Amino acid sequence: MRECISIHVGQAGVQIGNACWELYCLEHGIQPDGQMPSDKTIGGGDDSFNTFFSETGAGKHVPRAVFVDLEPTVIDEVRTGTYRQLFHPEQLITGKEDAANNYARGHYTIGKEIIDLVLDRIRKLADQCTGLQGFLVFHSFGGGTGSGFTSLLMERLSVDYGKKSKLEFSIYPAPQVSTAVVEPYNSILTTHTTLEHSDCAFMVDNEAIYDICRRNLDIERPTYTNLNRLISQIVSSITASLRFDGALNVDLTEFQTNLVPYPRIHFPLATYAPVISAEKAYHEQLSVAEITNACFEPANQMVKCDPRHGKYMACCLLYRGDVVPKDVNAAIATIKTKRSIQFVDWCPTGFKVGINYQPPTVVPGGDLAKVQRAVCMLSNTTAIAEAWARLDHKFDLMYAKRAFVHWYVGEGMEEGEFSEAREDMAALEKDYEEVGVDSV
Amino acid sequence: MREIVHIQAGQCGNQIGAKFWEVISDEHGIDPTGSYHGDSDLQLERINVYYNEATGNKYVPRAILVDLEPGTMDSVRSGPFGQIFRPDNFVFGQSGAGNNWAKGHYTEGAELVDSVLDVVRKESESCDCLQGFQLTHSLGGGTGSGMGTLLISKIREEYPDRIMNTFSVMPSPKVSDTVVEPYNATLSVHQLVENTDETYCIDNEALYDICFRTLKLTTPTYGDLNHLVSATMSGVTTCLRFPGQLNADLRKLAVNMVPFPRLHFFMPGFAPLLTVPELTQQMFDSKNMMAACDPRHGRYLTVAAIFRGRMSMKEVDEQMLNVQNKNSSYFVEWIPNNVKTAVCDIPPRGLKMSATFIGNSTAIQELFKRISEQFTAMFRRKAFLHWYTGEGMDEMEFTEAESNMNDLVSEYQQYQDATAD
């Protein structure tokens, strides 16, 4: 058992779900009509891929997923796209009016209108589960649905599923792709409203992903389709431990033991290698030690920060493909001597390693080279708090003149929610300082 | 579907509203009958935003034509395309407004108003998801100004949670001699500050100076001016009428452009009147603003730019990044990333690359200061108060609109002066 339900909220969450579920299918050999020739256990099974897919009696494997958007544009594309056949209609939940980039409309006004329907659909999924593990919530910080509705849903999930695990994949806003001047406000509000209800949240900085595409794939002006296809590879590495079997395979929950030293310090930094173009990958084979080094180059992180000017409280390597531990061990020993890896004084400095032998996949006509081996590093570094400073600074510039705050108050919110959210962020930033200070 | 309900009023209202429907009908592929003879289906994707669908595959503007004199109303259907409109949606008076604002707001417009309201409701209730309304009018012509602002007030009372977007045409002594226009405009503004979400300031002084100086038209016609306005108006709706990276609608524009509910008076810009650097350069140039204001005389609170045509957007990215860099002291520093841009593939008819520029600049106080000066030249004299105080208005009703608009610029100057540190 050990099933995970994925919830995709708002535009960014829904489109990243498209990327992810198309990739999963290609990894597990599922066709766009849900059929899987290799699964001989018809109508069910407890194979690893069943943690993400249920099976109908007719042989269809159906994502344990739910797409929610306050408007129908983005989810109508799913309803008619290549994988329309994968999803039962009840799984695709749209409204009529979106949140108009407003956390308040997402959380209260428009969002109170659909929450019960959503939770009812989520329940219909949980009820198919013989041993449900937790939820995977994909959403943007920036959008009004992404931020306001996500947090409403998170609050409600805590009520209906108690302490049952809620992980986040959160899109952190970047000027290069921003859609709204108000994205810092929505960002602080949802981060505050959710902090108590999330167990582990993997942040993706749109500028980090934008730069990586520009540098390593040279896409002059990458699209959401460019960005999402790279995000899905990192999402696939994190979940590979749940969907695939493996002798050398470490359950993601075992990495969470190491990644969360205190409940509020639950924001791991993801770094992925190799991201290389077909032409630059031709005749050039990247060794276990090469891709492992890449993980400690800050230009390969999902979030822009300098781990070199912060401290590690955890370091994990999730390898997939042609990798054996001897190589891994060699590579780590070299990096240890030749790189700037300072741990806080209260936690051991070892590196936690997992290996899935199934090699990464690329999507047809994608820009990513199909490589023989790949790695995602998950580290808990104080450096990530830089991303909170940047965002917290933008928030402050506008909130000191109360710019745009009337669109939030006219929807029923109070200025006190803003200062209460910001103060939580200020304490979050101080928590990140405290953990790195030495012991006495 | 996201339906805007259109509304033209008064003399200037209906005319600039007509050329609007002509231009977008042509871009969207729709002839004066209401049938679709277009190349790309991109012209229908969002066609329901401005168009009722009628069997026989006929598209009917969701428009409400209004006036207190039937002259303008007759010229409409007689005009090019007059037969694509809904005949029920004409709503004419007879008496007329006679360039009096009190006649449009309180008395003669007050009688015709409930009949217009009836037409609004019929069209509104037919909407899957009502965005709200856009009203074209002028702020000097008695019917457009007074009734327009009354019709706003009434629509807001019944749709308090829909966006009220107006195209308002500003009186310039370079285009109309009629002496009471500083009175009309100032009384309309006192209303526009309180009951609209977004107003594009269409300045006739800026349209006249454009045609005179840039276009070198010695004597320009209301048809030359209104040529500018339709290119403007086609621009600032391109993201409503066509797909895009962003799901543009009238509320998302308000959220992102209006940092304070009162400062919702936008300076529009068009270019050309070319290479991506030139559009960008011109489109930030005071000579391409459709309001008589210099951006380099205030600071931008927020800006939105629409690039129409087929251009390397990576170029547009760097070009728009260039202008803010080289012009940084002209964008408030306390609103980060306050310049957005969208790019559409379909350019208007006749230009291979246009750009349209919407700007919340504190230099708009320039426009309001002009009108506040023409106003007070009369009000200090008490001149013509009888046309209004005879229709039942107090004198304190003129003093109050005058102090309200005075404040609106104090506030524009308060945020131009504000700093981060």
Next chain:
Amino acid sequence: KREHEREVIQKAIEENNNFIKMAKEKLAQKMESNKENREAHLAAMLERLQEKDKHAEEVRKNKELKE
């Protein structure tokens, strides 16, 4: 030792519950203060739009004091 073994499991339940509680209540409180707030705002907008119609009565009644 068994007494303590059941106190720990009772504490975990007690706390898992008090958490589902305070959530449930924090939401309902927020949603209620929000409905009140948003409504107070729309009522304010009308009370003042409607004072505009009472001033359209006073204005028209002054012009009937003209004949």
